[PDB]
Amino acid sequence: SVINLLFAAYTGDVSALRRFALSAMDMEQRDYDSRTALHVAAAEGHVEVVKFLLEACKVNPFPKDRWNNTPMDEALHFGHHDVFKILQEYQVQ
Amino acid sequence: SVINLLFAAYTGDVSALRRFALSAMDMEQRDYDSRTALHVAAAEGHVEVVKFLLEACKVNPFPKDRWNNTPMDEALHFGHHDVFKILQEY
Ligand SMILES: [Cl-]
Ligand code: NA
Ligand code: NA
Ligand code: NA
Question: Where in the chain are disulfide-linked cysteines found (chain B)?
Fold first, then answer.
């Protein structure tokens, strides 16, 4: 459910995201702006959400939203260099 | 819900937006990116939706999303000059 998934990402609620993923929710669903849970969590600086989505849920690390922003772009723009470092571990090398 | 509102704006569904507004939905509500119905409709070039929100629902014409962009910024960015001129009047 887009609304539940992206608002849980927004508030940093890893416990809810775990319950969603365990019940087979698609953790890569997108809204009308082509935003993912990983975009929203990266923009808010929620390091533990970002790690959970990347490591446990295996989401795409570089989805592009309506403006072609990736989660890495959001982390830099909003000053979350800790999130940036986690995303960097997934780069095309 | 805010997600149903912004999806109706995204698809240009003026009829759904009218039902929502008549039922007392807050047409200025924001999602987790601080986006409004007006932002999404302007980004998509939906002139009828934009006029409905501005003229009937009386929404704020210049809300700022998390990137500090307004609906006018979105219309310009996506090349919707008719929406841009409508918002300019405010
Ligand atoms: Cl604002
Ligand atoms: Na929450
Ligand atoms: Na989009
Ligand atoms: Na990139």
Answer: none
CB A71 within 8 A of CB A40: no
Q: At what angle do helices B2-11 and B37-44 cross, to 10 degrees?
A: 20
Experimental method: X-ray
Total domain count, chain B: 1
Distance CA B31, CA B53 (A): 17
Q: Could you tell me the CATH number of the domain that includes residue B79?
A: 1.25.40.20
Enter the resolution in angstroms. Answer: 1.4
Any CB–CB contact under 8 A between A2 and chain B? yes
Out of A3, A7, A33, name the one closest to residue B35 (CB).
A33
Domain residue limits at B52: 1-90
Contact A7, A46 (CB under 8 A): no
